[PDB]
Coordinates of C-alpha atoms in Angstrom, one line a residue:
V3 CA 0.1 -0.2 0.1
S4 CA 2.8 2.2 0.7
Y5 CA 4.8 1.5 -2.3
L6 CA 1.1 1.8 -4.5
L7 CA -0.1 5.3 -3.5
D8 CA 3.6 6.7 -2.9
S9 CA 3.7 7.9 -6.5
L10 CA 0.1 9.2 -6.4
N11 CA -1.5 12.7 -5.3
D12 CA -4.8 13.9 -3.1
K13 CA -7.3 12.8 -6.2
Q14 CA -5.3 9.9 -7.5
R15 CA -4.8 8.4 -4.1
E16 CA -8.6 8.6 -3.3
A17 CA -9.4 7.0 -6.3
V18 CA -6.6 3.7 -6.1
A19 CA -7.4 3.4 -2.7
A20 CA -11.9 3.4 -3.4
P21 CA -13.7 0.9 -1.8
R22 CA -15.0 -1.4 -4.0
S23 CA -18.0 0.7 -5.3
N24 CA -19.6 2.3 -8.6
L25 CA -16.5 5.0 -9.3
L26 CA -16.7 7.9 -12.2
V27 CA -13.0 9.2 -12.4
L28 CA -13.4 12.5 -14.1
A29 CA -9.8 12.7 -15.4
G30 CA -8.8 16.3 -16.4
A31 CA -6.4 16.5 -19.1
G32 CA -2.3 16.1 -17.7
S33 CA -4.5 14.8 -14.8
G34 CA -2.8 11.3 -14.4
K35 CA -5.3 9.0 -15.8
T36 CA -3.4 5.8 -16.7
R37 CA -1.5 6.2 -13.1
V38 CA -5.2 5.5 -11.4
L39 CA -5.8 3.1 -13.8
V40 CA -3.1 1.3 -12.9
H41 CA -2.3 1.5 -9.5
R42 CA -6.3 1.0 -9.0
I43 CA -6.0 -2.7 -10.2
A44 CA -2.3 -3.4 -8.3
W45 CA -5.1 -1.8 -5.5
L46 CA -7.5 -5.0 -5.8
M47 CA -5.4 -6.9 -5.8
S48 CA -2.5 -6.9 -3.1
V49 CA -4.8 -4.7 -0.6
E50 CA -8.1 -6.2 -2.0
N51 CA -7.3 -9.7 -2.3
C52 CA -9.3 -9.9 -6.0
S53 CA -8.4 -12.5 -8.0
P54 CA -6.3 -10.9 -11.4
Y55 CA -9.1 -13.3 -13.1
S56 CA -11.8 -10.8 -11.8
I57 CA -10.7 -7.9 -13.4
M58 CA -11.8 -6.5 -16.9
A59 CA -9.9 -3.5 -17.8
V60 CA -11.4 -2.2 -21.3
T61 CA -9.0 0.5 -23.1
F62 CA -9.9 3.0 -26.2
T63 CA -7.0 1.3 -28.5
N64 CA -4.7 -1.6 -29.0
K65 CA -1.6 0.6 -27.8
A66 CA -3.5 1.9 -24.9
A67 CA -4.1 -2.2 -23.4
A68 CA -0.2 -2.4 -24.4
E69 CA 0.6 0.7 -22.6
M70 CA -1.6 -0.9 -19.6
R71 CA -0.3 -4.8 -19.4
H72 CA 3.3 -3.0 -19.3
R73 CA 3.1 -0.5 -16.6
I74 CA 0.7 -3.6 -14.5
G75 CA 3.5 -5.6 -15.0
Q76 CA 6.0 -3.0 -14.2
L77 CA 4.3 -3.6 -10.8
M78 CA 3.3 -7.0 -10.0
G79 CA 4.5 -8.6 -13.5
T80 CA 3.3 -9.2 -16.8
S81 CA 2.1 -12.8 -15.3
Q82 CA -1.6 -11.8 -14.5
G83 CA -3.4 -15.1 -16.0
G84 CA -6.9 -14.1 -15.7
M85 CA -7.4 -10.6 -16.2
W86 CA -8.7 -9.8 -19.0
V87 CA -6.7 -6.1 -20.6
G88 CA -7.3 -5.2 -24.3
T89 CA -10.5 -2.8 -26.3
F90 CA -14.1 -3.1 -26.6
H91 CA -13.4 -5.6 -29.8
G92 CA -10.5 -7.9 -29.0
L93 CA -12.2 -8.9 -25.3
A94 CA -15.3 -9.3 -27.5
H95 CA -13.1 -11.5 -30.0
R96 CA -12.4 -13.1 -26.7
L97 CA -15.5 -13.7 -25.4
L98 CA -17.0 -14.9 -29.5
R99 CA -13.5 -17.5 -29.0
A100 CA -14.3 -19.1 -26.1
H101 CA -18.7 -19.5 -26.6
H102 CA -18.6 -19.9 -30.5
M103 CA -20.7 -22.5 -30.7
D104 CA -23.0 -20.3 -29.0
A105 CA -23.1 -17.9 -30.6
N106 CA -23.3 -20.0 -34.0
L107 CA -19.8 -19.4 -35.2
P108 CA -17.4 -22.6 -36.5
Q109 CA -14.6 -23.1 -34.4
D110 CA -11.6 -21.1 -36.7
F111 CA -13.7 -18.0 -37.0
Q112 CA -12.6 -15.6 -38.8
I113 CA -13.0 -11.5 -38.3
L114 CA -13.0 -8.9 -41.5
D115 CA -11.0 -6.0 -41.3
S116 CA -12.1 -2.3 -43.6
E117 CA -9.5 -4.0 -46.2
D118 CA -10.7 -7.9 -46.6
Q119 CA -14.1 -6.3 -46.2
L120 CA -14.0 -4.3 -49.3
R121 CA -11.9 -7.5 -51.3
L122 CA -15.2 -9.7 -49.8
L123 CA -18.3 -6.8 -50.7
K124 CA -16.4 -6.4 -54.9
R125 CA -16.7 -10.7 -55.2
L126 CA -19.7 -10.1 -54.0
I127 CA -21.0 -7.9 -56.9
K128 CA -19.6 -9.8 -59.2
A129 CA -21.3 -12.7 -57.9
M130 CA -24.7 -11.2 -57.9
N131 CA -24.5 -9.6 -61.6
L132 CA -25.0 -6.4 -60.3
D133 CA -23.6 -3.6 -62.1
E134 CA -20.1 -2.3 -60.6
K135 CA -20.2 0.9 -61.9
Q136 CA -23.4 1.6 -61.0
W137 CA -23.2 -0.1 -57.5
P138 CA -20.1 0.8 -56.1
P139 CA -18.4 -1.9 -53.4
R140 CA -17.1 0.6 -51.3
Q141 CA -20.5 2.2 -51.4
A142 CA -22.0 -0.7 -50.9
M143 CA -19.1 -1.2 -47.8
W144 CA -20.2 2.3 -47.0
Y145 CA -24.5 1.3 -46.4
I146 CA -23.8 -2.3 -44.9
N147 CA -21.5 -0.3 -41.9
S148 CA -23.7 2.8 -41.8
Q149 CA -26.8 0.0 -40.4
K150 CA -24.0 -1.9 -38.0
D151 CA -23.2 0.9 -36.9
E152 CA -26.7 1.3 -36.2
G153 CA -27.7 -1.7 -34.8
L154 CA -29.6 -3.0 -38.2
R155 CA -29.5 -5.9 -39.9
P156 CA -31.0 -6.4 -43.9
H157 CA -35.0 -6.5 -43.8
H158 CA -36.9 -8.3 -46.5
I159 CA -38.1 -7.0 -50.2
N164 CA -38.0 1.9 -57.7
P165 CA -35.6 1.6 -54.4
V166 CA -32.3 2.7 -54.8
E167 CA -31.4 1.1 -51.3
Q168 CA -34.1 -2.0 -52.0
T169 CA -30.7 -3.0 -54.1
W170 CA -28.7 -2.0 -51.4
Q171 CA -30.7 -4.1 -49.2
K172 CA -30.1 -7.0 -50.9
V173 CA -26.6 -6.3 -50.5
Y174 CA -26.7 -6.2 -47.7
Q175 CA -28.6 -9.0 -46.6
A176 CA -26.3 -11.5 -49.9
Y177 CA -23.1 -9.9 -47.4
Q178 CA -24.3 -10.9 -44.2
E179 CA -25.5 -14.3 -45.7
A180 CA -21.9 -14.9 -47.3
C181 CA -21.1 -13.8 -43.4
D182 CA -22.6 -16.4 -41.6
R183 CA -21.9 -18.7 -43.7
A184 CA -18.4 -18.9 -43.5
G185 CA -18.5 -17.8 -40.4
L186 CA -16.0 -13.5 -40.8
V187 CA -17.7 -11.6 -39.0
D188 CA -16.3 -8.0 -39.0
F189 CA -14.8 -5.2 -36.6
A190 CA -19.5 -4.0 -36.2
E191 CA -20.6 -7.5 -36.3
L192 CA -17.9 -8.6 -33.2
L193 CA -19.4 -6.6 -30.5
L194 CA -23.3 -7.5 -31.9
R195 CA -22.3 -10.6 -31.4
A196 CA -20.9 -10.2 -27.9
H197 CA -24.0 -8.0 -27.0
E198 CA -26.1 -11.2 -28.7
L199 CA -24.5 -13.9 -26.3
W200 CA -25.0 -11.7 -23.1
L201 CA -28.9 -11.6 -23.5
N202 CA -29.1 -15.3 -25.3
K203 CA -27.6 -16.8 -23.3
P204 CA -28.5 -16.2 -19.2
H205 CA -25.7 -19.1 -18.1
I206 CA -22.8 -17.2 -19.9
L207 CA -23.9 -14.0 -19.3
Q208 CA -24.0 -15.3 -15.1
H209 CA -20.5 -16.8 -15.9
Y210 CA -18.7 -13.6 -16.4
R211 CA -20.9 -11.1 -14.1
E212 CA -20.4 -13.5 -11.4
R213 CA -16.1 -13.2 -12.4
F214 CA -15.2 -10.2 -13.6
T215 CA -16.6 -8.3 -10.4
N216 CA -13.7 -5.4 -11.0
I217 CA -14.4 -3.7 -14.4
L218 CA -12.6 0.1 -16.0
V219 CA -13.2 1.5 -18.4
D220 CA -11.0 4.1 -20.2
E221 CA -12.0 7.1 -22.2
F222 CA -15.6 6.5 -20.9
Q223 CA -16.5 9.8 -23.0
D224 CA -16.0 7.8 -26.4
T225 CA -17.6 5.0 -25.5
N226 CA -21.0 4.6 -28.6
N227 CA -24.3 3.1 -27.9
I228 CA -23.7 -0.6 -28.7
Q229 CA -20.5 -0.7 -26.3
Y230 CA -22.0 1.5 -22.9
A231 CA -24.8 -1.9 -23.9
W232 CA -22.1 -4.7 -23.5
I233 CA -20.7 -2.8 -20.0
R234 CA -24.3 -1.9 -18.1
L235 CA -25.1 -6.5 -19.1
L236 CA -22.1 -7.0 -18.0
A237 CA -21.8 -4.9 -14.6
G238 CA -25.6 -6.2 -13.9
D239 CA -26.4 -5.2 -10.2
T240 CA -23.0 -7.1 -8.4
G241 CA -19.9 -5.7 -10.8
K242 CA -18.2 -2.6 -9.7
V243 CA -17.6 -0.5 -11.8
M244 CA -14.7 2.5 -12.8
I245 CA -15.6 4.2 -15.1
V246 CA -12.5 7.4 -16.7
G247 CA -13.3 10.1 -18.8
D248 CA -13.9 13.7 -19.7
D249 CA -16.5 14.8 -20.8
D250 CA -15.4 18.6 -22.1
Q251 CA -12.7 16.0 -24.7
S252 CA -15.7 13.4 -26.3
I253 CA -14.6 14.8 -30.2
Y254 CA -15.7 11.4 -31.5
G255 CA -19.6 12.3 -32.2
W256 CA -19.5 12.2 -36.0
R257 CA -17.9 7.8 -35.6
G258 CA -21.0 7.3 -33.0
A259 CA -19.1 8.3 -29.5
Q260 CA -22.1 9.7 -26.8
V261 CA -21.2 12.0 -24.4
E262 CA -23.0 11.8 -22.1
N263 CA -23.1 7.7 -21.4
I264 CA -20.7 9.5 -18.8
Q265 CA -23.5 10.8 -17.3
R266 CA -25.8 8.2 -18.1
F267 CA -23.5 6.0 -15.8
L268 CA -23.9 8.3 -12.5
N269 CA -27.6 7.9 -13.6
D270 CA -27.5 4.2 -14.3
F271 CA -25.7 2.8 -11.2
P272 CA -26.5 3.4 -7.9
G273 CA -23.4 3.4 -6.0
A274 CA -22.4 6.1 -8.2
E275 CA -19.7 8.6 -7.1
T276 CA -17.7 11.2 -8.5
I277 CA -13.5 12.1 -8.6
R278 CA -12.4 14.6 -9.9
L279 CA -8.0 14.9 -10.8
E280 CA -7.5 18.5 -11.3
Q281 CA -4.5 19.1 -11.3
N282 CA -2.5 18.5 -14.0
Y283 CA 1.1 17.8 -14.9
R284 CA 1.0 18.8 -18.3
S285 CA 0.5 23.0 -19.0
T286 CA 0.9 26.2 -17.3
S287 CA -1.6 28.0 -15.1
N288 CA -2.0 31.0 -17.9
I289 CA -2.6 28.0 -20.6
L290 CA -5.6 26.3 -18.2
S291 CA -7.2 29.1 -17.2
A292 CA -7.6 29.5 -20.4
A293 CA -8.6 26.4 -21.2
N294 CA -11.5 26.4 -17.8
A295 CA -12.6 29.7 -19.2
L296 CA -13.2 28.1 -22.3
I297 CA -15.0 25.2 -21.8
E298 CA -17.2 26.4 -19.6
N299 CA -19.1 27.9 -22.8
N300 CA -20.6 24.5 -23.2
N301 CA -24.0 24.0 -21.1
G302 CA -24.1 19.6 -21.1
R303 CA -21.2 18.9 -18.7
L304 CA -19.9 18.4 -15.0
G305 CA -17.8 21.1 -14.3
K306 CA -14.1 21.2 -13.3
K307 CA -11.2 23.7 -12.8
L308 CA -8.2 22.3 -13.9
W309 CA -5.1 23.8 -11.6
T310 CA -1.4 23.4 -12.0
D311 CA 1.2 24.0 -9.1
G312 CA 4.0 24.1 -12.4
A313 CA 4.5 27.6 -14.0
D314 CA 2.5 30.6 -14.1
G315 CA 3.5 30.3 -18.2
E316 CA 4.1 32.9 -21.3
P317 CA 1.1 34.9 -22.8
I318 CA -1.1 32.3 -24.9
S319 CA 0.2 34.5 -28.3
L320 CA -2.9 36.1 -30.6
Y321 CA -1.7 36.4 -34.4
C322 CA -4.6 38.5 -36.9
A323 CA -2.9 36.8 -40.9
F324 CA -3.8 38.7 -43.7
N325 CA -4.8 35.8 -45.7
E326 CA -3.7 32.0 -45.2
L327 CA -0.4 31.7 -46.8
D328 CA 0.7 35.1 -43.8
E329 CA -0.4 32.6 -41.2
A330 CA 2.4 29.7 -42.7
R331 CA 5.2 31.8 -43.4
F332 CA 4.1 33.7 -39.4
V333 CA 4.2 30.1 -37.8
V334 CA 7.1 28.9 -40.0
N335 CA 8.9 31.7 -38.4
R336 CA 7.7 31.7 -35.5
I337 CA 9.2 27.8 -34.9
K338 CA 12.1 29.0 -36.8
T339 CA 13.0 31.0 -33.5
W340 CA 12.4 27.7 -31.6
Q341 CA 14.8 25.8 -32.4
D342 CA 17.4 28.7 -33.5
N343 CA 17.2 28.7 -29.2
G344 CA 17.7 25.4 -29.2
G345 CA 14.8 24.2 -29.0
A346 CA 13.6 20.2 -31.2
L347 CA 11.2 20.7 -34.3
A348 CA 9.2 17.8 -32.9
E349 CA 8.6 20.4 -29.1
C350 CA 6.1 22.3 -31.8
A351 CA 2.9 21.2 -33.2
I352 CA 1.0 22.3 -35.5
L353 CA -3.2 21.6 -35.9
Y354 CA -5.7 22.1 -37.5
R355 CA -9.5 21.6 -37.8
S356 CA -9.4 19.7 -41.7
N357 CA -6.8 18.3 -43.2
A358 CA -7.2 20.5 -45.9
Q359 CA -5.7 23.2 -43.9
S360 CA -2.5 21.3 -43.7
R361 CA -1.2 22.3 -47.7
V362 CA 0.4 25.5 -46.4
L363 CA 1.6 25.0 -43.9
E364 CA 3.8 22.2 -45.5
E365 CA 4.5 24.5 -48.3
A366 CA 5.8 26.4 -46.8
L367 CA 7.7 24.1 -44.4
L368 CA 9.5 22.5 -47.5
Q369 CA 10.6 26.8 -48.4
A370 CA 12.1 26.9 -45.8
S371 CA 13.9 23.0 -44.8
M372 CA 12.0 22.9 -42.5
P373 CA 11.0 18.7 -41.6
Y374 CA 8.0 18.4 -40.8
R375 CA 6.0 14.9 -40.1
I376 CA 2.0 15.1 -40.2
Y377 CA 0.9 12.5 -37.3
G378 CA -2.5 10.3 -38.0
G379 CA -2.4 11.3 -41.5
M380 CA -0.7 11.5 -44.4
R381 CA 0.2 14.3 -46.7
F382 CA -1.2 16.4 -48.9
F383 CA 0.1 15.7 -52.1
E384 CA -0.6 11.9 -50.5
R385 CA -3.5 11.5 -49.8
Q386 CA -5.8 9.3 -52.1
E387 CA -7.9 11.1 -53.2
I388 CA -5.3 13.6 -54.4
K389 CA -3.3 10.9 -56.2
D390 CA -6.6 10.2 -58.4
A391 CA -6.6 13.4 -59.2
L392 CA -3.2 13.8 -60.2
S393 CA -3.7 11.1 -62.5
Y394 CA -6.0 12.1 -64.1
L395 CA -4.0 15.4 -64.7
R396 CA -1.1 12.8 -65.7
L397 CA -3.0 10.8 -68.5
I398 CA -4.1 14.3 -70.0
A399 CA -0.6 15.6 -69.7
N400 CA 0.9 11.9 -71.2
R401 CA -1.9 8.6 -72.3
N402 CA 2.2 7.0 -71.8
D403 CA 2.0 6.6 -67.8
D404 CA 1.2 3.8 -67.2
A405 CA 1.3 4.2 -63.3
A406 CA -1.4 6.9 -63.8
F407 CA -3.5 5.0 -66.1
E408 CA -3.1 1.9 -63.3
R409 CA -4.3 4.4 -60.6
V410 CA -7.5 5.8 -62.6
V411 CA -8.7 3.3 -64.8
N412 CA -11.5 1.8 -62.1
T413 CA -11.8 5.0 -59.8
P414 CA -14.3 5.8 -60.1
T415 CA -15.5 1.7 -60.7
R416 CA -15.7 1.1 -64.0
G417 CA -16.5 -2.3 -64.1
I418 CA -12.6 -3.2 -66.5
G419 CA -12.2 -6.2 -64.2
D420 CA -8.6 -7.7 -63.1
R421 CA -9.0 -10.3 -65.9
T422 CA -9.0 -7.5 -69.1
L423 CA -6.5 -5.7 -67.5
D424 CA -4.0 -9.2 -67.3
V425 CA -4.0 -8.9 -70.8
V426 CA -3.9 -5.3 -71.6
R427 CA -0.4 -6.0 -69.1
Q428 CA 0.7 -8.8 -71.5
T429 CA 0.3 -7.4 -74.2
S430 CA 2.2 -4.0 -73.3
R431 CA 4.8 -6.0 -72.7
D432 CA 5.5 -8.4 -74.9
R433 CA 4.3 -5.3 -77.3
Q434 CA 6.6 -3.2 -76.0
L435 CA 3.9 -0.9 -75.8
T436 CA 2.6 2.2 -73.3
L437 CA -0.6 0.5 -71.7
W438 CA -2.6 3.0 -73.4
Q439 CA -1.1 1.8 -76.3
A440 CA -1.9 -1.7 -75.8
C441 CA -4.9 -0.8 -75.6
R442 CA -5.8 1.7 -78.6
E443 CA -4.6 -1.8 -80.2
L444 CA -6.6 -4.8 -78.4
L445 CA -10.0 -2.8 -78.5
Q446 CA -8.5 -2.7 -83.1
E447 CA -8.5 -6.0 -83.2
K448 CA -11.6 -6.9 -80.8
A449 CA -9.0 -9.2 -78.7
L450 CA -11.7 -7.9 -75.4
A451 CA -14.8 -9.7 -74.6
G452 CA -17.4 -7.4 -75.4
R453 CA -18.3 -6.4 -71.8
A454 CA -14.6 -5.5 -71.3
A455 CA -14.6 -3.8 -75.2
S456 CA -17.0 -1.3 -73.6
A457 CA -15.8 0.2 -70.4
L458 CA -12.5 0.1 -71.9
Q459 CA -13.8 2.7 -75.1
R460 CA -15.5 4.9 -72.5
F461 CA -12.5 4.9 -70.3
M462 CA -10.9 6.5 -73.0
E463 CA -13.1 8.3 -74.7
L464 CA -13.2 10.4 -71.3
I465 CA -9.5 11.1 -71.0
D466 CA -9.6 12.5 -74.3
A467 CA -12.6 14.4 -74.3
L468 CA -11.0 15.7 -70.5
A469 CA -7.9 16.9 -72.4
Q470 CA -9.8 18.5 -75.4
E471 CA -12.3 20.0 -73.3
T472 CA -9.8 21.8 -71.0
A473 CA -6.5 22.6 -73.3
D474 CA -7.5 26.5 -72.6
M475 CA -9.0 26.5 -69.8
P476 CA -6.3 28.3 -66.9
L477 CA -5.1 25.6 -64.4
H478 CA -7.3 25.4 -61.6
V479 CA -10.6 25.4 -64.1
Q480 CA -8.7 22.7 -65.9
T481 CA -8.0 21.2 -62.7
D482 CA -11.8 21.6 -61.1
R483 CA -13.0 20.3 -64.6
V484 CA -11.1 17.0 -64.0
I485 CA -12.8 15.9 -60.2
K486 CA -16.1 16.6 -61.9
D487 CA -15.6 15.1 -65.0
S488 CA -13.7 11.9 -63.8
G489 CA -16.5 10.8 -61.1
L490 CA -14.3 11.7 -58.2
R491 CA -16.2 14.5 -57.0
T492 CA -19.4 12.1 -57.5
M493 CA -17.5 8.8 -55.6
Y494 CA -17.5 11.1 -52.6
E495 CA -20.5 13.1 -52.5
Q496 CA -22.2 9.6 -52.6
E497 CA -21.2 8.2 -49.0
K498 CA -22.4 10.7 -47.2
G499 CA -21.3 12.0 -44.5
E500 CA -18.2 13.5 -42.4
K501 CA -15.3 10.9 -44.4
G502 CA -17.0 11.3 -48.4
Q503 CA -16.6 14.9 -46.9
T504 CA -13.1 15.6 -46.2
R505 CA -11.9 14.0 -48.9
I506 CA -14.3 16.5 -51.0
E507 CA -12.6 19.2 -48.7
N508 CA -9.4 17.7 -50.4
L509 CA -10.3 18.1 -53.9
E510 CA -11.5 21.8 -53.5
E511 CA -7.6 22.8 -51.6
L512 CA -6.6 21.2 -54.9
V513 CA -8.4 23.8 -56.9
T514 CA -6.7 26.1 -54.7
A515 CA -3.1 24.6 -54.6
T516 CA -2.8 24.6 -58.8
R517 CA -4.0 28.1 -58.5
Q518 CA -2.2 29.8 -56.8
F519 CA 0.9 28.2 -58.2
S520 CA -0.5 28.9 -61.8
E526 CA 6.3 28.0 -63.0
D527 CA 5.9 27.4 -66.4
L528 CA 7.4 24.3 -68.6
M529 CA 3.7 24.8 -69.2
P530 CA 1.2 25.0 -67.1
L531 CA 0.3 21.4 -66.0
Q532 CA 3.6 19.9 -66.2
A533 CA 5.0 21.9 -63.9
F534 CA 2.4 21.6 -61.3
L535 CA 2.7 17.8 -61.7
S536 CA 6.5 17.9 -61.1
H537 CA 6.3 20.5 -58.4
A538 CA 3.8 17.5 -57.2
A539 CA 5.5 14.4 -57.7
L540 CA 7.7 16.1 -56.3
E541 CA 6.6 17.0 -52.9
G543 CA 10.6 11.6 -53.5
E544 CA 9.4 13.6 -50.8
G545 CA 7.5 12.6 -48.4
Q546 CA 7.9 10.1 -45.6
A547 CA 11.8 9.5 -45.3
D548 CA 12.8 6.2 -43.9
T549 CA 15.6 8.6 -42.8
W550 CA 14.0 10.3 -39.2
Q551 CA 14.5 13.4 -38.6
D552 CA 14.2 15.6 -36.4
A553 CA 10.8 17.6 -37.7
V554 CA 7.1 19.7 -36.8
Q555 CA 4.1 17.8 -36.3
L556 CA 1.2 18.8 -37.9
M557 CA -2.1 16.8 -37.5
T558 CA -5.9 17.8 -37.6
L559 CA -7.4 18.4 -34.1
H560 CA -8.9 15.0 -33.5
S561 CA -4.9 12.8 -34.1
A562 CA -3.5 15.6 -30.8
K563 CA -6.0 13.3 -29.4
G564 CA -3.6 12.1 -26.0
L565 CA -0.5 14.3 -27.1
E566 CA 1.7 17.2 -25.6
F567 CA 4.2 19.7 -27.2
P568 CA 5.7 22.5 -25.4
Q569 CA 4.8 24.5 -28.3
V570 CA 1.2 24.5 -29.7
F571 CA 0.0 26.5 -32.8
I572 CA -3.5 26.4 -34.0
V573 CA -4.3 27.9 -36.7
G574 CA -7.4 28.7 -38.7
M575 CA -9.3 30.0 -35.7
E576 CA -11.3 31.6 -38.1
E577 CA -15.2 31.1 -38.0
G578 CA -17.2 28.4 -40.8
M579 CA -13.0 27.2 -40.6
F580 CA -13.5 26.5 -36.8
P581 CA -16.0 25.5 -35.8
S582 CA -16.7 23.8 -38.8
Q583 CA -19.6 25.5 -41.4
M584 CA -20.8 21.6 -41.8
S585 CA -22.3 22.8 -38.2
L586 CA -24.9 26.0 -39.7
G589 CA -25.6 24.9 -31.3
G590 CA -26.4 21.5 -31.3
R591 CA -23.0 20.3 -33.0
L592 CA -21.2 23.2 -32.0
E593 CA -20.3 22.2 -28.2
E594 CA -18.5 19.5 -29.8
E595 CA -16.1 21.8 -32.1
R596 CA -15.5 23.7 -28.4
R597 CA -14.8 20.7 -27.0
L598 CA -12.5 19.7 -29.9
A599 CA -10.8 23.7 -29.2
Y600 CA -10.7 22.6 -25.7
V601 CA -8.6 19.1 -26.3
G602 CA -6.1 21.8 -28.5
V603 CA -5.8 23.8 -25.7
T604 CA -4.9 21.5 -23.6
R605 CA -2.1 20.1 -25.5
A606 CA -0.1 22.8 -25.1
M607 CA 3.0 22.6 -22.5
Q608 CA 5.3 25.7 -22.4
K609 CA 3.1 27.7 -25.0
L610 CA 0.6 28.0 -27.1
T611 CA -0.5 30.1 -30.3
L612 CA -3.4 31.2 -31.6
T613 CA -4.4 31.9 -35.3
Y614 CA -6.1 33.7 -37.8
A615 CA -6.5 34.7 -41.3
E616 CA -9.2 38.0 -42.2
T617 CA -9.5 35.8 -46.1
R618 CA -8.8 31.8 -46.7
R619 CA -8.7 30.9 -50.7
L620 CA -11.0 27.8 -50.4
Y621 CA -11.6 25.7 -53.5
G622 CA -9.7 28.7 -54.9
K623 CA -11.5 31.7 -54.6
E624 CA -11.7 34.0 -51.5
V625 CA -13.5 34.0 -48.8
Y626 CA -13.2 36.5 -45.7
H627 CA -13.7 34.9 -42.6
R628 CA -14.1 36.4 -38.6
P629 CA -12.3 35.4 -36.2
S630 CA -13.6 32.1 -34.8
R631 CA -16.0 32.7 -31.8
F632 CA -13.0 31.0 -29.7
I633 CA -10.5 33.6 -29.6
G634 CA -12.8 35.7 -28.3
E635 CA -13.9 33.9 -24.8
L636 CA -10.7 33.6 -23.5
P637 CA -9.6 35.5 -21.0
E638 CA -8.3 38.6 -22.0
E639 CA -5.6 38.0 -19.0
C640 CA -4.4 34.9 -21.1
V641 CA -3.6 36.1 -24.2
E642 CA -1.1 39.1 -25.7
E643 CA -1.7 39.9 -29.7
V644 CA 1.7 39.3 -31.6
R645 CA 1.8 43.0 -34.0
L646 CA 4.7 44.6 -36.4
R647 CA 6.4 46.9 -33.7

């Protein structure tokens, strides 16, 4: 007990040494919540004399479970037979393994990841004799996952949804036949096992009387249901979470799950961890005030015994290129005084914002890395657009041909392409030239020939119809006519809209680039360079990421860019999405250890065109006493 409590502060000790009861630990940013979970589990075993067999700890990610295992083992050794520590999906899988027959699964049943799901759906659309062009496998995948995220099974039998429902029904039959289980299926089947098999549910409720769940604010409905059902009225549950940091709503997270726990678990008291070891008191004071503007919250006040801190810097840029230059110059000053580039993070609401920053960084010869995402010019939607432009530039661009011949899906199949490639090899031709000849020769199946003739017509027509357009207008035209814009639009939801945001940014990029051998070729050379991108050489590098990707990270210097109404808060929130945007801002503020800088531009070029934005509301919500504007003097 002395070694269990030595490293703890007063509130951490209150949680770790609490009697066995239902507990919310409302863990502020930077407040040592993993230490609490680890030491609480050690306490249960050491002081309360609970078996390792009685403990289930459920984490948000595979890395979080790995960290938990490693830190438990530091205290108590990694020989913890009996203790379940894992993600919702991993622990659902583990249950389904143990009871496969009772879950109507076969003995060596297999899990389908997104890539294997798509591959199965590609095969299914073909075996149903559906037109892949009209019924793209990726849209099937989007549809099916959308249904399963709502808990919906396929129903019965002009409706387009009717055809998708038929595909969903065939998918489910195929999975149930062969014992394939997708990620959504794991939790659903696990929950069904407990609902349907009383003697199984009683086993696990009698076994796992100590349940701990981290990151509870980002739990979804099915996860919440599964935990509640396991605990029944006998299990003693500690949840650890921060309602002010719930930011995965679009992914199905339920910020209200923390309050639902307090409502559903009679025991349930709340222990706040407000003492922060990350950030200066100035930064905390600004966080605390910012988040008060939300209503649906338990409330807390973060505090530290650490530095008072420098002001939060605020800069008004004339435009987005002004902004990127400023941020880069501030990091130069830090680096020149001996700071590491990796101790600097630049955070943005939408990943399409990264482009102008990357360009500014390249121009300064300052290494960077995108955390949790790809560099702009490596993003799938961008690579796909660029390959249409590459074919316009030169039909002999085999790599560009391969990238887009079937994107969006045109029902140009693998056997047909195998012929084209063999022909091009044998005849020492380009893929394009080989297509020309095979089509003239009537060498391909009629069904293969028709789609391929249209693809070649579309490319040639693009090149001719756009030949006297300015670079950015040709680019917009290509995004439209290739069907790229529609491919994302058809999959309603934030994920598709993000891809569209990047496409629109490529119109901005070409406009601002438009530096000549002809504009198109010069641009493509530039794009092909920034070669570039994802060095296998480690270097000290600035870290760029979305605010969503910064969750749980920390940096001495943080720059949050694009603090503009309509950028952040996002326009897509045109009150009930506003609070989540403010949570996201609060997550951004609380990444900063030593210094936070907030910037925004008077205008931004979006989709090629100059747009004015007022400063984000979140800037004015900060206490005046926390912030110093950076000005010319």
